[PDB]
Amino acid sequence: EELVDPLTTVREHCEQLEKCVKARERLELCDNRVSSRSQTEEDCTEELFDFLHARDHCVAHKLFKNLK
Amino acid sequence: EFGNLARIRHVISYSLSPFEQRAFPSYFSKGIPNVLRRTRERILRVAPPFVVVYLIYTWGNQEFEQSKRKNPAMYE
Amino acid sequence: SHTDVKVPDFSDYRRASKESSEAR
Amino acid sequence: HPLFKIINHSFIDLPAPSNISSWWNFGSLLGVCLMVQIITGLFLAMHYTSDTMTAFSSVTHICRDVNYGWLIRYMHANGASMFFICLFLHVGRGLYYGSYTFMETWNIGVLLLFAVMATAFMGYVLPWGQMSFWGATVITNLLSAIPYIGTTLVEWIWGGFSVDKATLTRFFAFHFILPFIIAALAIVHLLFLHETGSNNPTGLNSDADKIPFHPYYTIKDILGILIMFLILMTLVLFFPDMLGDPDNYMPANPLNTPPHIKPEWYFLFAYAILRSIPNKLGGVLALILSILILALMPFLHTSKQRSLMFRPITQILYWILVANLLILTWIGGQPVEHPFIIIGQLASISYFSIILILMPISGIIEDKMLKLY
Amino acid sequence: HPLFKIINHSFIDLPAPSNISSWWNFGSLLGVCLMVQIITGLFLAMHYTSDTMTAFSSVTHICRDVNYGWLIRYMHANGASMFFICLFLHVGRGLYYGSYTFMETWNIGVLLLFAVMATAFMGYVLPWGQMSFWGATVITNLLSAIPYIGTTLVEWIWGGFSVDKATLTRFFAFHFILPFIIAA
Amino acid sequence: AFKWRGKPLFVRHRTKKEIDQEAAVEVSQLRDPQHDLDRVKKPEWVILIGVCTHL
Amino acid sequence: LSRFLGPRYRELARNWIPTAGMWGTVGAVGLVWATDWRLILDWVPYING
Amino acid sequence: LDGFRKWYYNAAGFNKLGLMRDDTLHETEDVKEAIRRLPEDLYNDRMFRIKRALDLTMRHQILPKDQWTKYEEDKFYLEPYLKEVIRERKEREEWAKK
Amino acid sequence: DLELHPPSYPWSHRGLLSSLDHTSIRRGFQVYKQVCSSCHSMDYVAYRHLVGVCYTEEEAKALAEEVEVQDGPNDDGEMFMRPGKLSDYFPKPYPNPEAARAANNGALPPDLSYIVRARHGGEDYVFSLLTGYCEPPTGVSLREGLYFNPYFPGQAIGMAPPIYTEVLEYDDGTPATMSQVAKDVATFLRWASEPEHDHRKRMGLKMLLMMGLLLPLTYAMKRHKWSVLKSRKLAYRPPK
Amino acid sequence: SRLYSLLFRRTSTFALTIAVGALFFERAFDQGADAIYEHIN
Ligand SMILES: CCCCCCCCCCCCCCCCCC(=O)OC[C@H](COP(=O)(O)OCCN)OC(=O)CCCCCCCCCCCCCCCCC
Ligand code: HEC
Numbered sequence A: 001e002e003l004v005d006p007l008t009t010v011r012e013h014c015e016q017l018e019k020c021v022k023a024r025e026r027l028e029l030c031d032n033r034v035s036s037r038s039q040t041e042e043d044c045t046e047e048l049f050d051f052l053h054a055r056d057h058c059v060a061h062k063l064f065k066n067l068k
Numbered sequence B: 001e002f003g004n005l006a007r008i009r010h011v012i013s014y015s016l017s018p019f020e021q022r023a024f025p026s027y028f029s030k031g032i033p034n035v036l037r038r039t040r041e042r043i044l045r046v047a048p049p050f051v052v053v054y055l056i057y058t059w060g061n062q063e064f065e066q067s068k069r070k071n072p073a074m075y076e
Numbered sequence C: 001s002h003t004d005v006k007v008p009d010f011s012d013y014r015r016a017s018k019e020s021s022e023a024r
Numbered sequence D: 001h002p003l004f005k006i007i008n009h010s011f012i013d014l015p016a017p018s019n020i021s022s023w024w025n026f027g028s029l030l031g032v033c034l035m036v037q038i039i040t041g042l043f044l045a046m047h048y049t050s051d052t053m054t055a056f057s058s059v060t061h062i063c064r065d066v067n068y069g070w071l072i073r074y075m076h077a078n079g080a081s082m083f084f085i086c087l088f089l090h091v092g093r094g095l096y097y098g099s100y101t102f103m104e105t106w107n108i109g110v111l112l113l114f115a116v117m118a119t120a121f122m123g124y125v126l127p128w129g130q131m132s133f134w135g136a137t138v139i140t141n142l143l144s145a146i147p148y149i150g151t152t153l154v155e156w157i158w159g160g161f162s163v164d165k166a167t168l169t170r171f172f173a174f175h176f177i178l179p180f181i182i183a184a185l186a187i188v189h190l191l192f193l194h195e196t197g198s199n200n201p202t203g204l205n206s207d208a209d210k211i212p213f214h215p216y217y218t219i220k221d222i223l224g225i226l227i228m229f230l231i232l233m234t235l236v237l238f239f240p241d242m243l244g245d246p247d248n249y250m251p252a253n254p255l256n257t258p259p260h261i262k263p264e265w266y267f268l269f270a271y272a273i274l275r276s277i278p279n280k281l282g283g284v285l286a287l288i289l290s291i292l293i294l295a296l297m298p299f300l301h302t303s304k305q306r307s308l309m310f311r312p313i314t315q316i317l318y319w320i321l322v323a324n325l326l327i328l329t330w331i332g333g334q335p336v337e338h339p340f341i342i343i344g345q346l347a348s349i350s351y352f353s354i355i356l357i358l359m360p361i362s363g364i365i366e367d368k369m370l371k372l373y
Numbered sequence E: 001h002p003l004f005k006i007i008n009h010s011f012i013d014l015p016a017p018s019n020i021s022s023w024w025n026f027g028s029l030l031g032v033c034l035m036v037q038i039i040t041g042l043f044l045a046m047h048y049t050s051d052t053m054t055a056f057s058s059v060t061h062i063c064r065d066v067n068y069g070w071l072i073r074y075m076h077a078n079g080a081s082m083f084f085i086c087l088f089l090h091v092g093r094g095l096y097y098g099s100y101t102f103m104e105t106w107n108i109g110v111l112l113l114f115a116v117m118a119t120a121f122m123g124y125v126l127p128w129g130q131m132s133f134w135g136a137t138v139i140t141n142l143l144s145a146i147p148y149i150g151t152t153l154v155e156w157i158w159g160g161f162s163v164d165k166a167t168l169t170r171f172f173a174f175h176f177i178l179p180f181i182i183a184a
Numbered sequence F: 001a002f003k004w005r006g007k008p009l010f011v012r013h014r015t016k017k018e019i020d021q022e023a024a025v026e027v028s029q030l031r032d033p034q035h036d037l038d039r040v041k042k043p044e045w046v047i048l049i050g051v052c053t054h055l
Numbered sequence G: 001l002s003r004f005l006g007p008r009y010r011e012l013a014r015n016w017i018p019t020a021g022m023w024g025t026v027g028a029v030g031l032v033w034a035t036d037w038r039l040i041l042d043w044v045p046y047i048n049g
Numbered sequence H: 001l002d003g004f005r006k007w008y009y010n011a012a013g014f015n016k017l018g019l020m021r022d023d024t025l026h027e028t029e030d031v032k033e034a035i036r037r038l039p040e041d042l043y044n045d046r047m048f049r050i051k052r053a054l055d056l057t058m059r060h061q062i063l064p065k066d067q068w069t070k071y072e073e074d075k076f077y078l079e080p081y082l083k084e085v086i087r088e089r090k091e092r093e094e095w096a097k098k
Numbered sequence I: 001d002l003e004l005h006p007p008s009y010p011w012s013h014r015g016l017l018s019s020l021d022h023t024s025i026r027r028g029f030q031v032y033k034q035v036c037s038s039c040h041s042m043d044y045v046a047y048r049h050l051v052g053v054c055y056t057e058e059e060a061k062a063l064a065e066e067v068e069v070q071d072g073p074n075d076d077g078e079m080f081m082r083p084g085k086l087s088d089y090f091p092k093p094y095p096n097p098e099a100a101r102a103a104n105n106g107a108l109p110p111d112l113s114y115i116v117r118a119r120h121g122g123e124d125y126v127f128s129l130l131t132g133y134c135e136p137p138t139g140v141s142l143r144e145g146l147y148f149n150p151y152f153p154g155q156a157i158g159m160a161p162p163i164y165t166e167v168l169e170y171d172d173g174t175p176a177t178m179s180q181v182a183k184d185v186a187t188f189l190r191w192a193s194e195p196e197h198d199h200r201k202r203m204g205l206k207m208l209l210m211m212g213l214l215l216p217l218t219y220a221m222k223r224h225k226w227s228v229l230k231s232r233k234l235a236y237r238p239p240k
Numbered sequence J: 001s002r003l004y005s006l007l008f009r010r011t012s013t014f015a016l017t018i019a020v021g022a023l024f025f026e027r028a029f030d031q032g033a034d035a036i037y038e039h040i041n
């Protein structure tokens, strides 16, 4: 019986919002870009940091109500 | 010390006992007007330097961020 | 002289009678 | 008793101006803060050990095992911060109201300011955290800038090739002994002032209106002490780490360097200046001048009015000076990268140009406007 | 000049009796000894550690590895002895020549004498030798004599059941701080 | 580094490229004129003291 | 300073100059000796060592 | 320039305390010599004006607007007496210089 | 430097007078004992600090006697290990930091006693780091013994992710979800870095009540003793 | 008015009332304050 980590359920519920899906779209393009260009040193951290910043901001808005 | 501090003449000075007068006569009655009177004589000398400190601080922060933000044109 | 004027009014200061002094 | 005379001559029957504002409280607060620091420092000294193996352990033992030892330690740290807040406001009062014309009092003041900064620096080195060790090396290195005898002096102070136990123990001794010299210099500060009496915010001769100090400026100092204690205890009991650095809670690792090295916030203005000047020596000198420019201040007064109550252009220049002092405090915090650097360079240029050039020229212009010049 | 005025009135022109003997030197010697002690004490404080594991080791490190550290340590110890020699001769001068009729000066003196004895006692405890530890226990025990609050007071000072590190460190702090009160 | 004398004793090994670039560096154009080899007995081996000339 | 740009003021200084130099000399010698500055003391034949 | 000087006189704010311009001068040695040479009535008015300004600053008040010191009305009484002090002072200085 | 800045979480001790939840400190101590104690040390925390906070005297005595602690030289002149005492500190994972370097692929696991105090925004950081082992994005590659934790400086923390959902079972039975475990250990580490958090806040509440009583009264005394002057009326009466 | 004439006019009595009050105030303050802190947390 998988013990649901409320954090996971809150995480995809927060990824359903709009700033997270826009940053994920840049993340995708960014990662595709890095993937497409076989030899390059352009990482996706900035995009990824922006997506994680927005997502964990709205996660930390409402995570602790589900924790005993 | 007292007695040899200064020379004044014909300056009468009336006063009242502390217990005989109200402790906070019209404290908020005139206090507010006065505090407001005061703020309007000093706000134009005081505030605009701190306003442009706030603008420079924000500017620096944002500029720094943009500086850090990766150059899209670069690495492509 | 010294009687030309009277002590200025302190009504806005003065509170509103030994009876009261004890309390005051 | 003859002493009672001295007791009265300075605190009871002293003729004080009747119209001095709450800013004149601050110096008395500084004296109280000094005592508070000394008292708390004494109760830190009964359990602190100045050994590099045991200094961090002794500090944690104070915080965890001594009854109310955390209270005395954080009272000491936030009382150092309160000391520098009251010191900066005292110096700002002296600059704004023209109190620097009491030249001997001003010079004993800037000596006291140098002594207090040295005491706080060595005290911050004392807990032997990560931040203390890298901070010490940094400023001790500052001395190496000296053109010829620098290396020797640095090594002398360090007491060895690099800061190590040799330093910690002598820094404990010096940090212990300097606040008593500060107390003696404060007694000289009070003497050089009573000869002339305090100044008033209008800047005029207040000899016609002076009142006693016992019932008028004593209860006022008691109220200011109560408000300062309120701010100190809400700094200690509610936000005990808003002014300190988290990296000081790690032990001192000589192998590991922190990603960003700072002194505590009241040294920042200086830090900014130092970083601004490209030349190392230049930085050190400018840094010193930053504090010393004040001493130089009584020779720059070119106005026929002592205070800034009736001087609006120099009031504007004064608040611009307070503004870019706050800017230099912010920059010090910011890391080395655009555009923090340029601001730092300008802010330092503007600071020295306002104190050195702009205020006497403005005072000449203000004297010209009143048909005095 | 308000700082120099003091000296002129006190050290440069003070009207002094022309016939005072060499015994009147001794009090000035005491002041010099106080400074000497403070200066030597400061140079002991840059290497001494007030930890019971390391106090004896720090004292031996002062005597053996610090440049002229033996000189400063033995100057401090024999300067404490010289302080008490000059103190006893100062008190004997005051008793012999009737100087105790200056009553306030005499009472501030006996307060200074109590402070100097307490400072020297805790300073002798400080090197943490065999003799220091048994000496401390002994006099601290003296306090226990108090009729009702004695036990508590002793334990307070000791900072524990028996003198141990708790004492050494607070004795270092008190021995550091009292000569400035003596100067005041 | 082995914290020799209370200071980080940086001891480093360099690569063909590493050694190649350092030599390429313009000694005169260097802030401090000291060609890589000038400070190393072995190109593959460079040893330095870790105290920033600055502070 | 206006008052200090004076004729007698200059005379006074000129008369005072020699003494001033002497004092600097004493200090210089003093510093050399107190610091045991050897760069300078190495020149002196006997003082050497 | 005249209107801008009146605006600066209002912005300086010592007229709101009932002070003159010469009351606001910092008492140096020359200013105290000029004050000592004043006649008794002018000195008494100056001391009363300074005491009233100190009392108003104590209570953090100002005078009513009809009681302020009109720029046009302010009298530079100490000025004449001061110039002399400076003149005499300089003359003496020059003599010493030479 | 460039680092993800952990968000603000609504902690039960975040408020100005809000104390710590002691059941969470007990659960976080269990989390440290079963997971974090294998690599990290707690040199300035003893078992007797747990009495009156999370455990009773007998519970903390049993917790201390579960472990073995070398304690002193036998009369025969040698070392020996004994069951821990309420006076014993928490056991070392390694005898010296070089053993920690050897056992953790060159990395040194730091003292977790003051980690929350030593890490900027510690409580958050801790939670974030323990719950921030996300996959490295394209363009970044980490060597063995490294993990892309956005929050960790450099995003390359040697520590492998130590909290897998249901890593340990809470004795209280509260579901041991990764988060419930990270929040408990962040509360505990917080407690560790400041065992007096609760006592202080009580002192601060008494201080606010006393200052709210004493400031208007001292202000009233000052305004009494300053009313006299503040009512003084001056009049100039040249004899004329 | 009675209080002034009884415990607040003679300085000795003024001190007495202060000391006695303070002796009890602590009891009350601590009790009341603790109630509040507990209620809060
Ligand atoms: C000034 C033009 C005239 C303004 C007239 C306003 C109306 C006056 C008549 C109606 C009454 C309104 C309220 C009056 C209050 C008291 C009188 C007053 O405030 O006057 C205006 C004031 C002072 O004027 P005054 O000194 O007479 O002459 C102006 C010289 N510019 O001057 C001011 O208020 C403006 C001051 C502006 C200061 C701006 C400073 C900007 C720079 C800050 C830099 C900070 C650091 C930045 C970084 C540095 C390092 C890189
Ligand atoms: C219990 C769930 C915890 C918690 C709350 C933390 N850890 Fe560890 N840790 C381990 C190692 C080898 C390191 C150092 C890695 C490196 O420096 O590269 C760490 C580090 C930490 C930190 C410090 C982070 C920092 O910025 O310095 C923190 C806050 C932390 N951990 C929390 C090793 C281990 C373990 C052995 C596999 C386990 C178990 C834990 N840690 C458990 C925990």
Ligand code: HEM
Residues within 6 Å of the ligand: D034, D037, D038, D039, D040, D041, D042, D044, D045, D048, D059, D073, D076, D077, D080, D083, D116, D119, D120, D123, D124, D125, D126, D127, D175, D176, D177, D179, D180
């Ligand atoms: C003579 C009186 C004083 C004594 C005996 C004393 C003693 C001590 C001791 C033992 C410590 C180490 C304990 C600790 O870590 O807090 C310390 C720390 C410190 N002291 Fe003092 N001190 C005195 C006065 C002062 C003064 C006047 C200042 C302010 C200038 C000051 C500033 C500091 C600072 C900043 C620290 C570091 C606090 C920290 O760990 O964050 N001390 N002092």
Ligand code: HEM
Residues within 6 Å of the ligand: D023, D024, D025, D026, D027, D028, D030, D031, D034, D087, D090, D091, D093, D094, D097, D099, D100, D102, D105, D106, D108, D109, D110, D112, D113, D116, D182, D186, D189, D190, D193, D197, D198, D199, D200, D294
């Ligand atoms: C060690 C900390 C200090 C203490 C304890 C201290 C103490 C005092 C005290 C008690 C006063 C008289 C009350 C008052 O006017 O506020 C005073 C006034 C004064 N102090 Fe200080 N002071 C300190 C630092 C300084 C410094 C650093 C300066 C120099 C910048 C300075 C310059 C002055 C001046 C000029 C006055 C006169 C105030 C006036 O008449 O306007 N003080 N100080």
Ligand code: HEM
Residues within 6 Å of the ligand: E034, E037, E038, E039, E040, E041, E042, E043, E044, E045, E048, E059, E073, E076, E077, E080, E083, E116, E119, E120, E123, E124, E125, E126, E127, E175, E176, E177, E179, E180
């Ligand atoms: C503030 C100034 C002083 C400081 C910092 C200071 C510091 C020290 C230190 C660190 C020691 C231990 C080193 C040692 O074993 O000698 C010591 C020892 C001692 N001090 Fe002081 N001291 C001071 C003033 C004095 C004074 C005024 C006296 C005399 C009353 C005194 C009497 C002693 C004695 C008797 C010892 C024991 C010496 C021994 O080991 O035989 N000290 N002091």
